Structure formats: structure tokens, C-alpha cells
Design an enzyme around this catalytic site. Structure first.
Site, mmCIF file in Angstrom:
data_model
loop_
_atom_site.group_PDB
_atom_site.id
_atom_site.type_symbol
_atom_site.label_atom_id
_atom_site.label_comp_id
_atom_site.label_asym_id
_atom_site.label_seq_id
_atom_site.Cartn_x
_atom_site.Cartn_y
_atom_site.Cartn_z
ATOM 1 N N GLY A 16 8.533 8.689 -7.477
ATOM 2 C CA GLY A 16 9.969 8.173 -6.936
ATOM 3 C C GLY A 16 9.962 6.818 -6.401
ATOM 4 O O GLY A 16 9.074 6.103 -6.831
ATOM 5 N N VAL A 17 11.004 6.382 -5.717
ATOM 6 C CA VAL A 17 10.988 5.110 -5.391
ATOM 7 C C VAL A 17 11.484 5.080 -3.911
ATOM 8 O O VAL A 17 12.591 5.715 -3.576
ATOM 9 C CB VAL A 17 12.326 4.341 -6.297
ATOM 10 N N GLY A 18 10.540 4.293 -2.914
ATOM 11 C CA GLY A 18 10.669 4.383 -1.770
ATOM 12 C C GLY A 18 11.549 3.300 -1.308
ATOM 13 O O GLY A 18 12.063 2.595 -1.865
ATOM 14 N N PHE A 20 10.453 0.449 0.256
ATOM 15 C CA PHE A 20 9.979 -0.566 -0.618
ATOM 16 C C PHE A 20 8.938 -0.043 -1.695
ATOM 17 O O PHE A 20 8.154 0.498 -1.564
ATOM 18 C CB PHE A 20 9.493 -1.517 0.395
ATOM 19 N N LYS A 22 7.818 1.290 -5.727
ATOM 20 C CA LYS A 22 7.772 2.437 -6.591
ATOM 21 C C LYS A 22 6.336 3.118 -6.562
ATOM 22 O O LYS A 22 5.408 2.567 -6.418
ATOM 23 C CB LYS A 22 7.973 1.918 -8.008
ATOM 24 N N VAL A 23 6.512 4.424 -6.441
ATOM 25 C CA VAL A 23 5.356 5.400 -6.459
ATOM 26 C C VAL A 23 5.122 6.024 -7.731
ATOM 27 O O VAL A 23 6.012 6.715 -8.360
ATOM 28 C CB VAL A 23 5.514 6.165 -5.115
ATOM 29 N N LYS A 38 1.464 3.493 -4.864
ATOM 30 C CA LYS A 38 2.794 2.736 -4.371
ATOM 31 C C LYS A 38 2.521 1.232 -4.931
ATOM 32 O O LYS A 38 1.581 0.551 -4.341
ATOM 33 C CB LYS A 38 2.881 2.826 -2.955
ATOM 34 N N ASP A 132 12.649 6.741 9.726
ATOM 35 C CA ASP A 132 13.256 7.320 8.338
ATOM 36 C C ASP A 132 12.573 8.811 8.160
ATOM 37 O O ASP A 132 12.299 9.191 7.142
ATOM 38 C CB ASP A 132 12.946 6.407 7.026
HETATM 39 C C1 LIG Z 1 11.714 -0.436 -8.725
HETATM 40 C C2 LIG Z 1 10.781 -1.496 -8.789
HETATM 41 C C3 LIG Z 1 9.712 -1.308 -7.965
HETATM 42 C C4 LIG Z 1 8.623 -2.380 -8.039
HETATM 43 C C5 LIG Z 1 8.704 -3.243 -9.186
HETATM 44 O O1 LIG Z 1 7.447 -3.957 -9.371
HETATM 45 C C6 LIG Z 1 6.520 -3.456 -10.330
HETATM 46 N N1 LIG Z 1 6.967 -2.290 -10.940
HETATM 47 C C7 LIG Z 1 5.873 -2.133 -11.729
HETATM 48 N N2 LIG Z 1 5.570 -1.087 -12.472
HETATM 49 C C8 LIG Z 1 4.463 -1.017 -13.207
HETATM 50 C C9 LIG Z 1 4.073 -0.147 -14.139
HETATM 51 C C10 LIG Z 1 2.916 0.512 -14.005
HETATM 52 C C11 LIG Z 1 2.543 1.469 -15.192
HETATM 53 C C12 LIG Z 1 3.601 1.922 -16.102
HETATM 54 C C13 LIG Z 1 3.060 2.887 -17.059
HETATM 55 C C14 LIG Z 1 2.959 2.396 -18.118
HETATM 56 C C15 LIG Z 1 2.754 3.320 -19.202
HETATM 57 C C16 LIG Z 1 2.630 4.710 -19.032
HETATM 58 C C17 LIG Z 1 2.898 5.022 -17.706
HETATM 59 C C18 LIG Z 1 3.154 4.055 -16.751
HETATM 60 O O2 LIG Z 1 3.285 4.504 -15.382
HETATM 61 C C19 LIG Z 1 4.531 0.958 -16.225
HETATM 62 C C20 LIG Z 1 4.694 -0.089 -15.216
HETATM 63 C C21 LIG Z 1 3.119 -1.936 -12.849
HETATM 64 CL CL1 LIG Z 1 1.848 -2.059 -13.499
HETATM 65 C C22 LIG Z 1 3.659 -3.087 -11.922
HETATM 66 C C23 LIG Z 1 4.863 -2.998 -11.347
HETATM 67 N N3 LIG Z 1 5.374 -3.941 -10.300
HETATM 68 C C24 LIG Z 1 9.825 -3.012 -9.959
HETATM 69 C C25 LIG Z 1 10.693 -2.383 -9.867
HETATM 70 C C26 LIG Z 1 11.540 -2.465 -10.565
HETATM 71 O O3 LIG Z 1 11.900 -1.620 -11.690
HETATM 72 O O4 LIG Z 1 12.728 -3.277 -10.474
#
Ligand SMILES: Cc1ccc(Oc2nc3nc(-c4ccc(-c5ccccc5O)cc4)c(Cl)cc3[nH]2)cc1C(=O)O
Ligand SMILES: Nc1ncnc2c1ncn2[C@@H]1O[C@H](COP(=O)(O)O)[C@@H](O)[C@H]1O
Ligand SMILES: Nc1ncnc2c1ncn2[C@@H]1O[C@H](COP(=O)(O)O)[C@@H](O)[C@H]1O
Lengths: 442, 184, 299
Positions: A16-18, A20, A22-23, A38, A132
């Protein structure tokens, strides 16, 4: 092989999305152990200037050790993101359980509420307000145990200070939160818990409307429907918890005393209970041992001389708590021999000093009064000042905070609050003397 | 130390190439919208690019560096503070930032304001000294105060040239409500 | 043996301070009459004294100060006690101390052994607990508070051989030169016996010889509450008439009774002393908390 790995955990689907971040679910590369990760973006935190809140949130979750609050195992720092490795629960949201079954049965509903309130009380005793609380933020494990999770909208409550920040969903927010008024903290969490108890038992919200201004009028009115399938005992508890007046609203102690809440309640969930001192470790008690003998005393407990030292404090604490009439005054039997007869009458005490004049005219009179008494002040707000005066005898600075409040349509109030951070003098005497000088001048 | 390389932009096939892998194409795994890779990297400056759908591109949100010829590579500084949480939070706090006591009165508003002072919280109206004790107990005893009423000043109306001030203060896990009788 | 002495050394004064309590402080420039009326309205016996010029706590204002003012300055029921009406706390202290007594206090970090030793050595009843870090007065420590605290921990340690011993065997308290008052003794005379003998209570004796009432230093404050301080010619019986209704009698003890029972009776009653009597109900003397705490801790 080319999978995204943080530590030894392979990141899977987004849970989900909290408030602050992403989880995401994490699975151990070697064992398959499941965690909830998170992910906090460092730039997103910087852009929102939430650096202070994130710092306090991590500090508390590391300190927190409760079976009905999601555990934080570790925080992995990277140049772009923060990875909070937390305890994973398979059952998901309590909201989804309520929807699946329509409404939760009285026995299971009480059990879950007792666990939620146990977690809420732990936060309050550690000076933390969740702000919350909703079934979406209450998670379930494999054994149907409740766990509160999103501490993004949380804040710490300090002595003399109030909280204002408009936090949470409108359906679970207290009337003071909606109104944008200052509140103490705990009473706001108790309102939200009252809405959760109603949603557990009814499978519906007590205050719900498609039109937001009507929903706000409903909450402020505090009038909600009590269904026929609910017994009068639960009804009174809900009505006491969902009081519009924060002063008339139930406290955790009030709920703990309620006949409905008391039923089948485990003796280890709350402090002072028969099994709390025997099964729950006390942080303040361990800290007291540290100065006497800093090292871990866990090995002696899991009988050694070091273990007896911990239990001596725990025993002494129980004796002092059992003698309730010795440390605290009872609510209004032979009278106490030292009870003094009345004089000759009955003068009433009041907060600071009241004024019916314009707020700008009151403030102008304050600045002039301070200047004559050789005071130094900082303007943090148009109605909030931080005053200072050097004591001539002790040679130490005396600090106090001045705040103007609205009583009614024509009445105003100037609040005086001491600031503590005197060996020759007295701190409380310095505050009273600084107040007296300003009161007499005004 | 782990370093994140995320592609926020769109695409079907995304690759990563930099100074850390002699500018060779590394395939990035996709979630629903993000293309990510977490690589162990040493401290220092690192140059990198992105190969999206057979075209060379860079992340605009990250710092830009142009070579002697004209190729655009993103630059990332891997620091010692980036590995520890509380050290990383200390760097992030001072980045956001980038006075003294005076006897000067503050102006009414930046622009003319009729803005009213905040509404008085009802908790402060719960005066501890106006409440009855209960006869059985010691007259010095008082009930446990609300943390919110602490440090606040309470007073009696001035009578026969003497003013009475009170406040509830904390000493460890205990509370003292001191009263002071002094001539005005 | 010496179990209670070891208990006092281990426990700090902080452990005795209530979770929530009130403390009345007077500025030394305050009129003495207003100060005694303030003790009544706030329901307190003693109050620490703050000298705003010296910026320090200089002493304590108790009911003993009121007893001393009345006996020194009372002339008649026909003429008002001028000094009580116009004297400030500082002006009264100047004539009273003539003996520049320093502030007798205790730190909240100091042991109960130090507090008990201070209460006995200085022959005092009320000892202010002042935090050396903030300079704030936190609590007024008494013999009652100390003894009631020990009563809560009696089950926590083995009871010594002296607790099972008789009061006659231990010989704790005064059994000679017992200062008493008659049923018809004027209040002024009773105040003189307080000043001269420095005792906290005087037993009231009828014409037949029986002990009907007890006139304590605390009872004197009723002269301020009822505003009857101007007529000290009235009897002790007339001065105690305000509490005639809802009064069980004079709390006494026997010479054959064990020290444990005396402690329990004193703690339950929340009173400073019992009148001792022999096998016959014959007055043999008095046993106060100062005698009890001296035997339990000091020896
Ligand atoms: C809503 C949100 C929350 C946090 C955010 O900042 C980050 N999102 C991230 N996603 C990732 C992430 C982690 C795992 C994966 C992944 C890749 C392949 C298979 C499964 C996965 O979970 C994709 C992206 C990482 Cl490593 C760092 C992040 N830092 C960005 C967003 C956003 O989409 O704007
Ligand atoms: N009415 C009295 N007559 C003679 N001695 C007393 C009387 N009241 C108390 N005492 C003794 O005087 C000492 C201090 O008394 P108190 O002021 O009760 O602590 C103790 O040793 C008591 O035994
Ligand atoms: N032995 C006793 N028997 C009955 N009443 C007492 C006794 N000692 C003190 N009192 C009363 O208890 C109150 C408290 O006084 P004190 O014990 O001196 O702190 C006074 O009003 C006394 O009249």
C-alpha cells in the site's frame, strides 16, 4: 538474479501507500522470512520539510516494544531513499475484515478493541498521539491480533503545549480537529477508537455523508444512530467515547472501568494489572539499574543477583501504587484530623488576566509594559511572545511565554507559561515574580 | 553500501550504464511503473546514463554533467553520511535551512490583518485549586494534573493590596502546585 | 535488628513526596494576619518563607508562630492585638529570632535517615524538601508521612525482636513532667504552657481527674478561622466546642501493648501522639512519632 534486493530481502508487491512513502513486501533470499519495507524518498522529505517529523517517527518506533504496534526491525539508509524494515502481518487491514463479515460479533469485536486500546494507551504513556486511527491503519496477523501501523500523522505531546494540526480522515476525526482548534491530544485518539468500536459492531460509520459540510455538521452535533442489536452497556461506552465536549469525553481509565470492556480482558494488556509486572519488561526500571550497576540484564532474568535488583524496584513501585490515597487525592468515612474549618468567602482561581478590549490594543499595552520593566522578547507570532529578564541577585535569566487567547465574542485572555531548561534562587519564584511585575503594570 | 537507481519515466525496455560498470548496458527490472536496480557502490563521484527503448536519455531530477565532447551523464556523490540514518537526516535538515532577543515591538501585520487570536482550549479552564479534595485524605494532596495545564499561571483577584499566584510544575514523575502570596 | 535503619538509608526523600500536592509560600513582606488566614483557606499548617530581596527561602511559618504572637501580644478581650493586625512576617521574625537560625532543609535525593536525623536533632516537625538544581520547594516532610511510609513496607522485610516487645519493656516516650491542661484552663494559659514546654499537645483533665479532651497546636488555628483569637480568656473546653460533634475521644495506648500495635494505631489515626496508660486507665505519660522514629531509626 536481477531482482531488487535491500539487505538480504527481495522486494515484491506493493502492500500500500501510507501518509508518507510506499510500503512493499520483502522476502528473505535464503529463508523466505517476510517483512514489510516502508520506502521513504529523501528528496520528497526535503521538498516537504518533514525531516524533523521523520526523525521523531524513527526514534519512537525504535523505542516502541508493544505486541499490538508494528515492530521496526531496522532502518537502511541509502543516498536517495530510507528503507524501514518492519514486522509483516498476513491478515491485512481490519477495514477489509469488517467488510468481509458485514459486522464483527461482540466477543471478537471486544477482544480486538481491548488490543487496540492497549496499543493506544502505550503510545499515550510514551507521550505519543497517533492522530490517524481507523480500521485501515489497524492490521491483523495470522492469529487475528490487531496491530496499529501508520505513525506518519503522529506527534509528541509536551508539558503545557497543545496540538492543532488537522490530521486524519474526516470520518474518524474529532469535532475539535474538524473545527481547526487547539487540543491536548489523547481525547482525539479516544474519539477515533469510538468510531472503530462502532464500525466493528455495526459495520457502518456513526457519522457519514456524501456532502462534506453536512458530515462536519453531523460530527460537531455528535448525534449518531444506536442500532437495536447493541446492548445498553456498549451503547453507554460509545456515547461516552463520542462526546463532542473533550472534557466530558471518556479517558482510557474510564473505558478500563466500564463493565462491558472489563469482560474476558487479559491481565497483561494494561499497566497495574495482575500479570503486567510479571510478563512485561519496564524500560524506566531497567534505566534505574543502569546508573547503579548500562549492560544488559536480560541473561539473568531469562536467580542471579543482578535480576533481584530489577524486581526490587518493581515490587517497591507496586506498594507505592497500591497506596493510592497516600500519593493522590480522592474525588469528592471520617474526615482527616488535619482538615481545616472554613474562614469567617470561597475565592475562585483564574487563568492569567482577562481583557474585553481589542486584541491589537491588548498586545500594544503588553510591549509597553515589558519595555518599562527592562524585558527582552522574541516575536514568534502576533499573539505569541517569548520573554526574558535577567535576575539581579542570582545573575540568571528568567524565561516565559506569553499567548493571547479568545474566550468569547467580546472576551480575551493573556496566558503566562514558564520555560524550563536557579541554584541560588528558585525557578518557580522567578516565574511568579516576573508575572507579578507584568500583571501590576498592565 | 547500497545505492538506488530508479527510472520514473515510461518505457518498455530500460538499461543502466555508468563508470561503475565500464559503460555496459545492465537490464533494469520493472514493477508496475518503476525500473529499478540496487547496486553496492564505494564512496565518491559516479557518472551514469539510461538506455530507454533504443534511445539515450537521463533523469532530469538528478544532477547533470556534460563531458568534453557533449555526452550528458547524471552525477551522484556517495557519502559516508548516506549509510547511517541519523547522519543522513542531519545532512537533510541543514540543507532545508540553506534570531536574537530585542526590545522592539512587532508590527500588526505584513498586510492589514483582522486575524483573531486562537480560541482558548477548554482544558486550561480545569482549575486544580477550585476543585474539592474529598475529606478523608490529606489537605496537601491534589489529583493528577493534565500535562497540558503544567507551567501555566493561575491567579486570584487582588484583595487588600496582596496578589496570589499559582502554577503546577513537574519534578521527575511528580507534580507540585505552588502558591505565592506577595504584596502588589 | 536495625532493619528499619537500613531501609531509611536505601530510600530517598523523593519516594515520600506525593504524585500531586499543593505548597503555600509567603513573601516575608506579607502581613502575619493575612498569612495565618491563608493557611486556613488553603487548608495547610506550615508554609516556607521566601525573602524576595535575598532571593532565598529563609524559614517556615507554622501555627507555633501564631501561638507565640498571641501569648506575647494578647492584653485583653477589650483591646485588639495591634502587633497581630499590623506586623509583617519579617518584622515578627526580627523580634522572635532576636538566635539567627538558618533554613533547616533536605534535598529530594537525600535518604530518609538524613530527614529523620534532621527532624530529631533540630527538634522540628515540618522539614522542607528543596531541589538543589531548580531551588524549588517541593514538599513539607513530617513524622506522620515518614511513619506511614514505613507502615507500607513492614511486610517487605523481617520484623525485628523489638516490634514484639512491650512499650514498658522498651521505655519509649515521656513518663515524667507531663504538661497538662484543666477543663476550665483559659486559652492564654494553655498557649503559655506550649511556649514554655515546647510540646505539640496538652491533654485536657476534668475536676474528677479523667482525661476528657486533647488540645493540640493544630487546634489553636481555629481561633483564626472562627476569628475568636481576640478573646483568649475563654476555657480550652469552649475553644474545642467547634469539634464536639463527630469526636470519638482521646486516642490512648497501654504500657502492656506491643510497639507494632502503637505504630499501627498512630498510622491509622493520622495523629501525632497517644496518651499512655497502665493496666488501670491511669495516665502514665505520652508517646509521640518523634519518640517512635528515634527508637526505630536513630538507635
Ligand atoms: C509513492 C511513492 C513513494 C515513494 C517513492 O520513492 C521511492 N519509490 C521507490 N520504489 C522503489 C522500488 C522498489 C522495488 C521495486 C520493484 C522492482 C521489481 C520488482 C518488485 C519491486 O518492488 C520497484 C521500485 C525503490 Cl527501490 C525506491 C523507491 N523510492 C516514490 C513514489 C512515487 O511513485 O512517486
Ligand atoms: N503534653 C506533654 N507533656 C510532656 N511531654 C510531652 C507532651 N507532649 C509531647 N511530649 C514529649 O515531648 C517530646 C516532643 O513532643 P512532640 O512535640 O509531640 O514531638 C517527645 O519526647 C514527647 O514524649
Ligand atoms: N491522642 C489524640 N486523641 C484524639 N485526638 C487527637 C490526638 N492527638 C491529636 N488529636 C487531634 O488531631 C488533630 C491533629 O493534630 P496533631 O496530632 O497534633 O497533628 C488535632 O485536631 C487534635 O485535636
Amino acid at each position: 538474479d536481477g531482482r531488487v534486493k535491500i539487505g538480504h530481502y527481495v522486494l515484491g508487491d506493493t502492500l500500500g501507500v501510507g501518509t508518507f512513502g510506499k510500503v512493499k513486501i520483502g522476502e528473505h533470499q535464503l529463508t523466505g522470512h517476510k517483512v514489510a519495507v516502508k520506502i521513504l524518498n529523501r528528496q520528497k522529505i526535503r521538498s516537504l520539510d518533514v525531516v524533523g517529523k521523520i526523525k521523531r517517527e524513527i526514534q519512537n518506533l525504535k523505542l516502541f516494544r508493544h505486541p499490538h504496534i508494528i515492530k521496526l526491525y531496522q532502518v537502511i539508509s541509502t543516498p536517495t531513499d530510507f528503507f524501514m524494515v518492519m514486522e509483516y502481518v498476513s491478515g491485512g487491514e481490519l477495514f477489509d475484515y469488517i467488510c468481509k463479515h458485514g459486522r464483527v460479533e461482540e466477543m471478537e469485536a471486544r477482544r480486538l478493541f481491548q488490543q487496540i486500546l492497549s496499543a493506544v494507551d502505550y503510545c499515550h504513556r510514551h507521550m505519543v498521539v497517533h492522530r490517524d486511527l481507523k480500521p485501515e491503519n489497524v492490521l491483523l496477523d495470522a492469529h487475528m491480533n490487531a496491530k496499529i501501523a501508520d505513525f506518519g500523522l503522529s506527534n509528541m505531546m509536551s508539558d503545557g503545549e497543545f496540538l492543532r494540526t488537522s490530521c486524519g480522515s474526516p470520518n474518524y476525526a474529532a469535532p475539535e480537529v474538524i473545527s481547526g482548534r487547539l487540543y491536548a491530544g489523547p481525547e482525539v485518539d479516544i474519539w477515533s477508537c469510538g468510531v472503530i468500536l462502532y464500525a466493528l459492531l455495526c459495520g457502518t460509520l456513526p457519522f457519514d455523508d456524501e456532502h462534506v459540510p453536512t458530515l462536519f455538521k453531523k460530527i460537531r452535533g455528535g448525534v449518531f444512530y444506536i442500532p437495536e442489536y447493541l446492548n445498553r452497556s456498549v451503547a453507554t461506552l460509545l456515547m461516552h467515547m463520542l462526546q463532542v465536549d473533550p472534557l466530558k469525553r471518556a479517558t482510557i481509565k474510564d473505558i478500563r472501568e466500564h463493565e462491558w470492556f472489563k469482560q474476558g480482558l487479559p491481565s497483561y494488556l494494561f499497566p497495574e494489572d495482575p500479570s503486567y509486572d510479571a510478563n512485561v519488561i519496564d524500560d524506566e526500571a531497567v534505566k534505574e539499574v543502569c546508573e547503579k550497576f548500562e549492560s544488559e540484564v536480560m541473561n539473568s532474568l531469562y536467580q542471579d543477583q543482578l535480576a533481584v535488583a530489577y524486581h526490587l524496584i518493581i515490587d517497591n513501585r507496586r506498594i507505592m501504587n497500591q497506596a493510592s490515597e497516600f500519593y493522590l487525592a480522592s474525588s469528592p468515612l471520617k474526615p482527616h484530623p488535619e482538615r481545616m474549618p472554613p474562614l469567617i468567602k470561597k475565592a475562585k482561581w483564574h487563568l492569567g488576566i482577562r481583557s474585553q478590549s481589542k486584541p491589537y490594543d491588548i498586545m500594544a499595552e503588553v510591549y509597553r509594559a515589558m519595555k518599562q520593566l527592562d524585558f527582552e522578547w522574541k516575536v514568534v507570532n502576533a499573539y505569541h511572545l517569548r520573554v526574558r529578564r535577567k535576575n539581579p541577585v542570582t545573575g540568571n535569566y528568567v524565561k516565559m511565554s506569553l499567548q493571547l487567547y479568545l474566550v468569547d465574542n467580546r472576551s480575551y485572555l493573556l496566558d503566562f507559561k514558564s520555560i524550563d531548561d536557579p541554584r541560588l534562587g528558585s525557578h518557580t519564584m522567578d516565574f511568579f515574580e516576573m508575572c507579578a511585575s507584568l500583571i501590576t503594570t498592565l | 553500501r547500497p545505492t538506488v537507481f530508479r527510472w520514473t519515466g515510461g518505457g518498455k525496455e530500460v538499461y543502466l550504464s555508468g563508470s561503475f560498470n565500464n559503460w555496459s548496458k545492465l537490464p533494469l527490472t520493472r514493477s508496475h511503473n518503476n525500473f529499478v536496480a540496487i547496486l553496492d557502490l564505494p564512496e565518491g563521484e559516479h557518472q551514469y546514463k539510461f538506455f530507454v527503448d533504443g534511445q539515450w536519455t537521463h533523469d532530469p531530477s538528478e544532477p547533470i554533467v556534460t563531458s568534453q565532447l557533449g555526452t550528458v551523464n547524471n552525477i551522484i556523490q556517495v557519502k559516508k553520511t548516506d549509510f547511517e540514518v541519523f547522519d543522513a537526516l542531519m545532512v537533510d535538515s541543514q540543507k532545508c535551512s540553506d534570531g536574537p532577543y530585542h526590545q522592539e515591538p512587532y508590527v500588526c501585520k505584513p498586510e492589514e490583518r483582522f486575524r483573531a487570536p486562537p480560541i482558548l482550549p477548554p482544558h486550561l479552564l480545569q482549575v486544580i485549586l477550585n476543585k474539592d479534595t474529598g475529606i478523608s485524605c490529606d489537605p496537601a494532596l491534589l489529583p493528577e494534573p493534565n500535562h497540558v495545564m503544567l507551567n501555566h499561571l493561575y491567579a486570584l483577584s487582588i484583595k487588600d493590596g496582596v496578589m496570589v499566584l499559582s502554577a503546577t510544575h513537574r519534578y521527575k514523575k511528580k507534580y507540585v502546585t505552588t502558591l505565592l502570596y506577595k504584596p502588589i | 535488628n536495625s532493619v528499619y535503619t537500613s531501609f531509611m538509608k536505601s530510600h530517598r526523600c523523593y519516594d515520600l513526596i506525593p504524585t500531586s500536592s499543593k505548597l503555600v509560600v509567603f513573601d516575608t513582606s506579607l502581613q502575619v494576619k493575612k498569612a495565618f488566614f491563608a493557611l486556613v483557606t488553603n487548608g495547610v499548617r506550615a508554609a516556607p518563607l521566601w525573602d524576595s530581596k535575598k532571593q532565598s527561602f529563609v524559614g517556615m511559618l507554622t501555627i507555633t508562630d501564631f501561638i507565640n504572637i498571641l501569648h506575647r501580644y494578647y492584653k485583653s478581650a477589650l483591646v485588639q492585638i495591634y502587633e497581630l493586625e499590623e506586623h509583617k512576617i519579617e518584622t515578627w521574625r526580627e523580634v522572635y529570632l532576636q538566635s539567627f537560625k538558618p533554613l533547616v532543609c533536605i534535598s529530594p535525593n537525600a535518604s530518609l535517615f538524613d530527614a529523620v536525623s534532621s527532624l530529631i536533632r533540630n527538634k522540628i516537625h515540618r522539614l522542607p524538601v528543596i531541589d538543589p538544581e531548580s531551588g524549588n520547594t517541593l514538599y513539607i516532610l513530617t513524622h506522620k508521612r515518614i511513619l506511614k511510609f514505613l507502615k507500607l513496607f513492614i511486610t517487605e522485610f523481617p520484623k525485628p525482636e523489638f516490634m514484639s516487645k512491650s512499650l514498658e519493656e522498651l521505655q519509649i516516650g515521656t513518663y515524667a513532667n507531663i504538661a497538662m491542661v484543666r477543663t476550665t484552663t483559659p486559652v492564654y494559659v494553655a498557649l503559655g504552657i506550649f511556649v514554655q514546654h515546647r510540646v505539640s499537645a496538652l491533654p485536657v483533665v476534668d475536676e474528677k481527674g479523667r482525661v476528657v479532651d486533647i488540645y493540640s497546636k493544630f487546634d489553636v488555628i481555629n481561633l483564626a478561622a472562627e476569628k475568636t483569637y481576640n478573646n483568649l480568656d475563654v476555657s480550652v473546653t469552649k475553644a474545642l466546642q467547634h469539634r464536639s460533634h463527630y469526636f470519638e475521644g482521646v486516642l490512648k495506648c497501654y504500657l502492656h501493648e506491643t510497639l507494632e500495635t502503637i505504630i499501627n494505631r498512630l498510622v491509622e489515626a493520622e495523629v501525632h501522639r497517644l496518651v499512655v496508660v497502665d493496666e488501670n486507665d491511669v495516665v502514665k505519660g505520652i508517646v509521640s512519632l518523634s519518640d517512635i522514629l528515634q527508637a526505630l531509626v536513630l538507635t
